Amino acid sequence: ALGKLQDVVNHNAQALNTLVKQLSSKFGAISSVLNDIFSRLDPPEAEVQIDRLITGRLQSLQTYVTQQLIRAAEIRASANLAATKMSECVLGQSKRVD
Amino acid sequence: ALGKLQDVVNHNAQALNTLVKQLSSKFGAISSVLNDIFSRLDPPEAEVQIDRLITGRLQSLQTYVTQQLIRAAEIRASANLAATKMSECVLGQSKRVD
Amino acid sequence: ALGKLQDVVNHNAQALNTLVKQLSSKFGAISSVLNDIFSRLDPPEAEVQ
Amino acid sequence: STECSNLLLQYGSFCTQLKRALTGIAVEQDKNTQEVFAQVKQIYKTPPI
Amino acid sequence: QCVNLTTRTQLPPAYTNSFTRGVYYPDKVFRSSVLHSTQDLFLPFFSNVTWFHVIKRFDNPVLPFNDGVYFASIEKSNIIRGWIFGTTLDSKTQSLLIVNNATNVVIKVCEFQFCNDPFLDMESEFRVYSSANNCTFEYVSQPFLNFKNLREFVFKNIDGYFKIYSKHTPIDLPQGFSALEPLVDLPIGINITRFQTLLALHRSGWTAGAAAYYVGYLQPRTFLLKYNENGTITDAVDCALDPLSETKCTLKSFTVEKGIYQTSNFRVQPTESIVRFPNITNLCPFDEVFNATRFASVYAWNRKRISNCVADYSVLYNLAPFFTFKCYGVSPTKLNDLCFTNVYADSFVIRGDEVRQIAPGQTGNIADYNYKLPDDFTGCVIAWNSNKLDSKVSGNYNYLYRLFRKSNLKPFERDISTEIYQAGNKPCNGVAGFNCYFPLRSYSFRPTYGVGHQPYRVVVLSFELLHAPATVCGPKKSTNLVKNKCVNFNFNGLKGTGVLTESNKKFLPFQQFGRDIADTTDAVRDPQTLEILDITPCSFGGVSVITPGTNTSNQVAVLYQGVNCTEVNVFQTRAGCLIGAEYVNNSYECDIPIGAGICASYQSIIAY
Amino acid sequence: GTGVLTESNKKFLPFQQFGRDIADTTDAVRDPQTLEILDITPCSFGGVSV
Amino acid sequence: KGLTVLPPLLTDEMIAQYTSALLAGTITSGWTFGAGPA
Ligand SMILES: *[C@@H]1O[C@H](CO)[C@@H](O[C@@H]2O[C@H](CO)[C@@H](O)[C@H](O)[C@H]2NC(C)=O)[C@H](O)[C@H]1NC(C)=O
Ligand SMILES: *[C@@H]1O[C@H](CO)[C@@H](O)[C@H](O)[C@H]1NC(C)=O
Ligand SMILES: *[C@@H]1O[C@H](CO)[C@@H](O)[C@H](O)[C@H]1NC(C)=O
Ligand SMILES: *[C@@H]1O[C@H](CO)[C@@H](O)[C@H](O)[C@H]1NC(C)=O
Ligand SMILES: *[C@@H]1O[C@H](CO)[C@@H](O)[C@H](O)[C@H]1NC(C)=O
Ligand SMILES: *[C@@H]1O[C@H](CO)[C@@H](O)[C@H](O)[C@H]1NC(C)=O
Ligand SMILES: *[C@@H]1O[C@H](CO)[C@@H](O)[C@H](O)[C@H]1NC(C)=O
Ligand SMILES: *[C@@H]1O[C@H](CO)[C@@H](O)[C@H](O)[C@H]1NC(C)=O
Ligand SMILES: *[C@@H]1O[C@H](CO)[C@@H](O)[C@H](O)[C@H]1NC(C)=O
């Protein structure tokens, strides 16, 4: 019955969960842990490895923010519809069919 | 007369054609063909070249998904409008001007 | 009173300003200026930067 | 390339994210068609005259 | 000491179902109340596990180790005592021995001279091996040990590390779940391809006690592991076993709701590899370039074209006299596997310290005024010391370099003009004088100088990659051509996986291969036969698993999207081929949407 | 790393040395000298708004 | 190259059938069918 709200909660929690899970991705580096890179490599190669992890995580974060913006636009449209229903169905009688 | 629907078909076909066309991009690598990269380089540098291709293609695919989601939001808004017109113009008589 | 239009103008101008300010970002390279890369490094590594 | 897929596994759930977003769009289009056209649960037919 | 056992009864080994056994902890990491996906060497669920009995039955064959071994033991009275691992099981190679006798657990790595039939026998008789010459590692550990005991072990040999995972259960194989705890991490660093278990006899000849063991093999796959609040693995999902578990693995949950889920993409795998190279074989004249008595000077470097030959570069790498064998646009070890055209050998002699300057993008004197390489250069630079041949005690002055020039050279440009240079404001008019110097000066090569100044012979091999018909190829042999089948082909260094078919594309005579919108090769001209083969990628499509809730049922159906039913309860839809659902001419409301007017429901799973 | 070390209620198995949480980050560690389990809560993080 | 077009759940003839049902309702019953029984 309440699938639409459950979907909103599930998509937000799933996006957050996926965003934290992306921290455990090597992104083509020797390790997903920055400390391992500091302890295992010299700074000339360490700068490259941290650069790879930073660009991968930054791309993941930008993807998450873009998904949040699109979902925010969808929820804003639904909220505008809900405000219209509150004004026209609750605060008055509507002649609009369905 | 039917420019809006043909326009939607054109955007979807053009987005797919662009996504296919983006495979022909070196993305700062020696070649745009992955098999050449394997057939030509040792894994320490071939891994870097394959990475360059993978990040370019993944950026292309995320870009395509992002415009697909934005177009999905636009088409969803248009479909919500069409459902409102079907409910209020076809299934009833509307006092709303225009 | 006119906050909504001022907000639209501010977001467009701020987005353009941020897009301008992103050109002064090295993005991991030795310099944000292309000319400095052509003059300070050899073409095998200047191509990468 | 099998080796490219093996290297692609190091990037995590990007592929799953893109497939899930496309699947959401795909079900959304069918939902849009249901919302627009399937507003009657009775299939009415015109009289023969 | 060895004893032949000749009282066996002939019987084939049995087979049974693995059920959900063979699961182990993938790592030393605690996890609590989570689902974790791992790609490791695992035993598939419900697999065909080999069954051996000890009852007059005495089953001790020697089995291949493969990539990993699951050993199950339905044991009472501890007949099974240990295992033997190795490659040849003799003194030629090195072998690993695991034993548990009456007192202590012994792990040894020695070159044992093993018996053909090794076994154990109060216990006061040990006939396992006759000799042990070179022992490199010893490890003494704790005791590992109606049928009462289930002993499950997993042996892996990854990166020279031999991992033993173990579990003991108080009890065919029982149906249930028991995770195997890691027991021994062993640093051996030896090759293991074959194993044999050790049994114990009972003497009163000999009598075999009642025991049963099972041997299974590990394959690389992904499991979805469930970890409870106490960190103990309680359930697992094999992602490649059945579509329902594939859906569970994809959704990262053990319960799947009713609906259709995109899980993976079916693609047919290649059956055999075909290599097509030109039939023409001519020994390539690398001897002329590399073994010549005299080389040209760096200002007048010699360029030789190499075409219409098969080149074996393996004889160049394995020889040790060349100090520098450095390749830029191609791997050194892949040169035998590729085909080239535009091959050039540029031979010259330079100093010891100038070998770094024969490279793309280098700043130097001979780089600018003698020999320039482009930024997009592909090929290999070869440099070796030639003090024995290109040096004289009185001074070898035959090699000259351009010290002075007005401007830097272009890539692959040779300057042999002996014109004077103007180094000052005053014009020189072709006559030497103040600030007027000859551009070409000779090297003072003497054998007494140290490294860095000694003469070095440098040969630059320049290639082009795949953008033309190739005439120089590696020693790889040409295979026959197969039509209408998925193969992984190699055409002149171009690797692909596809079906090779007849084509109706009218190629022009110069044209060799063809490229689609994406620029991946779609057609190719095969060497030796000159025919035009169309390349179509192998059959593939999306797999969707239509299922009701796992609370309701475990039955699933699969939809192969955009794939006709003849290229994979079979029903053909516009959406694709549906397997596992039975079409019903009755019409109901849509429960699980399939597409193209087709929906699925559970009543068995029906499609309507 | 950097974090607050607290006594842990987790029952690590003998092989297990370090522990991962819901999101696969290192939330528990076993001390190499005294075999006890310690949770590693991260140092407090806050968003400073003015 | 990995691109596929999934068919819509409602085919063109069924969408046409839905429009036919809406046309028959609005012609034979006016707006009554949209608010309850036709
Ligand atoms: C037990 O039987 C095996 C197999 O017949 C014997 O192994 C062979 O022994 C002969 C002795 O002349 C050798 O020539 C063969 O090379 C052996 N074969 C293998 C595969 O090793 C074994 O010697 C027997 N045991 C005893 C104690 O005689
Ligand atoms: C196991 O393998 C044997 C032969 O190796 C075969 O006869 C048997 O049918 C297999 N069992 C199953 C369940 O496939
Ligand atoms: C291990 O031995 C087998 C044969 O016993 C051989 O085929 C294989 O190449 C060897 N592997 C290594 C890594 O030495
Ligand atoms: C068990 O094996 C070890 C190692 O060879 C040996 O020292 C010990 O004496 C053996 N036990 C008996 C009872 O012989
Ligand atoms: C192995 O043993 C043989 C004979 O016992 C000996 O000649 C050989 O040198 C040994 N090799 C090593 C590596 O110990
Ligand atoms: C977890 O452990 C606690 C005590 O340590 C016990 O009460 C509980 O039953 C255990 N749960 C499971 C699922 O084993
Ligand atoms: C190389 O040249 C030397 C003499 O210059 C000759 O003796 C030798 O046989 C040659 N080797 C090859 C492989 O041509
Ligand atoms: C070998 O290849 C050439 C073209 O490179 C072709 O003309 C010739 O017929 C081929 N010969 C054989 C025996 O395949
Ligand atoms: C030394 O370490 C061992 C385990 O590594 C531990 O059991 C023992 O208590 C430690 N001793 C001291 C004095 O810390």
Residue numbers in the entry:
A (entry chain C), B (entry chain A): 944 to 1041
C (entry chain B): 944 to 992
D (entry chain A): 746 to 794
E (entry chain C): 14 to 68, 77 to 142, 153 to 176, 185 to 210, 215 to 247, 257 to 620, 641 to 675, 691 to 695
F (entry chain B): 548 to 597
G (entry chain A): 856 to 893
Provide the publication's sentences verbatim.
SARS-CoV-2 relies on a trimeric spike protein for host cell entry via recognition of the angiotensin-converting enzyme 2 (ACE2) receptor. The RBD mediates attachment to human cells through the ACE2 receptor and is the primary target of neutralizing antibodies. The Omicron variant has 37 mutations in the spike protein relative to the initial Wuhan-Hu-1 strain, with 15 of them present in the RBD.
Cryo–electron microscopy (cryo-EM) structural analysis of the Omicron spike protein ectodomain shows that the overall organization of the trimer is similar to that observed for the ancestral strain and all earlier variants. (B) Cryo-EM map of the Omicron spike protein at 2.79-Å resolution. The RBD in one of the protomers (protomer 1) is well-resolved and is in the “down” position, whereas the other two RBDs are less well-resolved because they are flexible relative to the rest of the spike protein polypeptide. The mutations in the Omicron variant spike protein are distributed both on the surface and the interior of the spike protein, including the NTD and RBD regions. The mutations in the RBD are predominantly distributed on one face of the domain, which spans regions that bind ACE2 as well as those that form epitopes for numerous neutralizing antibodies. (C) Cryo-EM structure of Omicron spike protein indicating the locations of modeled mutations on one protomer.
